[PDB]
Design a protein around this ligand. Structure first.
Ligand code: NI
Length: 376
């Protein structure tokens, strides 16, 4: 039974023999390396007295993925000051009032706030919504907008489901199949965006008129992951059609950066809402695939396991997500090995570090029992 029911979160590091003190230290140190003054590893930058952002170090921009991740990290760490700085910057610079995506958040901005695009990234929106619910529950809704967290969360999820009913916009979920879309204007998806564990919570906290929908989306996403992951290797493509097969029209049909999050998502869903045979078997497959592979040699792979020459651009993120996956297969043959590999992998330095380090902190939180559901 999941932590949603028991209200107790598995500390997998502790169960695998790491000491409580060393785990506490490592979690704090990971946070400080990302959010404190550690220039080589840092991803969060403060602006003035009321603003802040996470920088995609590779692309030298600010992404809704990173901002929404940062808000989730901040609420898990009980840091309202950081949460509010990030959410303030997001609302000021990213929220769109004009164009076909009005009501959504521009996916990429320059550090000065300028929008690079008026298109959104749905995985940002879903993280914003849950982070905002958790903020409301930990701290209470603020008296002034946009710090009225729960109202902001319900409003955003309203748009995600209903956009286009009274305008030229489009929803972020397909209403017939209940699957999240890659972007609002296409009819394909991205397995790593599927967060059934988030949708379960939306089914409790969203506008009542959408609560049944969110339950259906949770179930649809769970079923979709079964068809999207390769049956032998467990590997999921970055983009996939609704039929589950890879969309490689632009090179996103393989196991690469986006895909890494699938194992992590499966880990967190198992922890929050309970284990399943499918999830344990899926994590065992991914871990088996990587069991004889050295991180320095990690590649892009076809989902059937065939390697490309191209190296993984985010091998530390891959390590972190595979370790986080162990939450879904705690007795798996490679579960301990993956957790140990992650323990022995430092936070990333250099220009590609942002993505790796986001995945790293999520795994540190989840594996230590600190990635929690915050209830009203
Ligand atoms: Ni120590």
């Amino acid at each position: 039974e999941g932590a949603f029911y028991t209200r107790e979160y598995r500390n997998l590091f502790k169960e695998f023999g790491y000491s409580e003190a060393e785990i506490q230290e490592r979690v704090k140190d990971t946070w400080e390396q990302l959010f404190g003054d550690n220039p080589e590893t840092k991803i969060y930058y403060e602006v003035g007295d009321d603003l802040g952002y996470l920088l995609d170090t590779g692309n030298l921009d600010v992404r809704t993925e990173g901002m929404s991740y940062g808000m989730m990290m901040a609420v898990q760490m009980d840091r309202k000051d950081i949460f509010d700085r990030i959410w303030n910057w997001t609302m000021k610079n990213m929220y769109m009032t004009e164009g076909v995506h009005a009501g959504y958040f521009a996916w990429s901005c320059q550090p000065d706030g300028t929008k690079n695009s008026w298109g959104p990234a749905p995985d940002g929106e879903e993280y914003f919504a849950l982070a905002l619910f958790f903020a409301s529950h930990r701290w209470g809704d603020g008296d002034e907008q946009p710090f009225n967290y729960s109202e902001q969360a319900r409003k955003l999820l309203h748009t995600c489901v209903h956009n286009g009913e009274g305008g030229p916009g489009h929803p972020m979920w397909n209403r017939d199949n209940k699957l999240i879309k890659f972007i609002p204007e296409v009819e394909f998806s991205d397995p790593s965006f599927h967060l059934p564990h988030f949708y379960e919570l939306f089914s409790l906290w969203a506008n009542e008129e959408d609560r049944v929908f969110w339950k259906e989306a949770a179930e649809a996403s769970r079923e979709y992951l079964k068809i999207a992951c390769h049956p032998e290797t467990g590997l999921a493509p970055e983009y996939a059609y609704y039929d589950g097969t890879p969309n490689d029209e632009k090179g996103y049909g393989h196991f690469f950066s986006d895909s890494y999050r699938v194992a992590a998502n499966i880990g967190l869903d198992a922890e929050w809402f309970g284990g399943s045979e499918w999830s344990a078997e899926e994590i065992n497959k991914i871990q088996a695939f990587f069991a004889d592979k050295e991180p320095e040699d990690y590649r892009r792979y076809k989902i059937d396991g065939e390697p490309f020459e191209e190296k993984s651009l985010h091998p530390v993120g891959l390590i972190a997500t595979n370790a986080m996956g162990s939450l879904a297969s705690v007795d798996g043959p490679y579960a301990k090995a993956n957790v140990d590999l992650f323990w022995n992998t430092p936070v990333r330095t250099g220009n590609r570090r942002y993505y790796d380090n986001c995945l790293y902190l999520f795994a540190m939180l989840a594996l230590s029992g600190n990635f929690k559901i915050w209830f009203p």
